[PDB]
Amino acid sequence: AITKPLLAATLENIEDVQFPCLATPKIDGIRSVKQTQMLSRTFKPIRNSVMNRLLTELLPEGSDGEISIEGATFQDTTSAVMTGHKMYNAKFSYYWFDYVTDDPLKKYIDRVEDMKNYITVHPHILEHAQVKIIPLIPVEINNITELLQYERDVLSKGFEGVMIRKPDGKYKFGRSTLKEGILLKMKQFKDAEATIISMTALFKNFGYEDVMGSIEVDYDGVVFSIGTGFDADQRRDFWQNKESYIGKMVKFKYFEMGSKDCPRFPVFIGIRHEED
């Protein structure tokens, strides 16, 4: 059984987390759990029956996760899910982040292992023509350094922030608190709009001629490098038109450490627009 969904609670403080903890990326979509068929957060069926069908038929009983459409708005990905379609045919993906088996009093570590095993036992689960299942196997953490890195890591892969779990954690039928530490939400990273100044040549010799390697950036007063965030689409076009890029605007994300105006792990998000 899973009676009420596992709602998370949000972090007001960052040095607020117990250690050897486990973590994954937050998904920006529609919550769905398998009990006979697929359910919404509010436990009425998934109205897109093709979604409901194809999931129940891949996922095992007890799987907790999130429907999303890879690269669509959070509100069109609703229209796909929150509308009863007899004949859907578009591609979408489901994020598997918990699995209940039976007893909900067992530990997250163990729940994850049931998850890991079931995948190795039913490897087609991952290989579907229409539905992409994506299992979020939480990576380990040990430092506050190690966490903040995870968040940087996450955003760069285009996720909103990170979820933090206590290993021995129960499946709570409702919302986790600060102290019980099952699901915390982490969005401690600040989004900002900034100006570039100099590139540096790269360095020649959960998923399943030089080029720019890192920029140097202004952003009101301050001077630091962004290395992480770009791709071989971007990096390879920054370098070629470097003198055409110096000083244009770039959307980024960062954490604020000790009292110096100079971020920790900054991340590139986007090239900014020049319209009205």
- 29-135 is a CATH 3.10.450.710 domain: no
DSSP one-letter string for 66-126: EEE-TTS-TTHHHHHHSS--SS----EEEEEEEE-SS-TTS-HHHHHHHHHHHHHHSGGGG
Q: Which CATH class is domain 187-269?
A: mainly beta
Q: Considering only CA atoms, which of 245, 235, 185, 230 is closest in space to residue 209?
A: 235
Is 179 annotated in a binding site? The answer is no
Asked if residue 86 belongs to a known ligand binding site, the reply is: no
Which 3-state string (H, E, C) describes 14-68?
CCCCCCCCEEEECCCCEEEEEECEEECCCCCECCCHHHHHHHHHHCCCCEEEEEE
Resolution limit, Å: 3.0
Other Cβ atoms less than 10 A from the Cβ of 263: the count is 21
Q: Does domain 1-28+136-186 have CATH number 3.40.50.11750?
A: no
- Would the annotation count 107 as a binding residue? no
253 labelled ligand-binding: no
Residue-range domain boundaries for the chain: 1-28+136-186, 29-135, 187-269
77 is in an annotated binding site: no
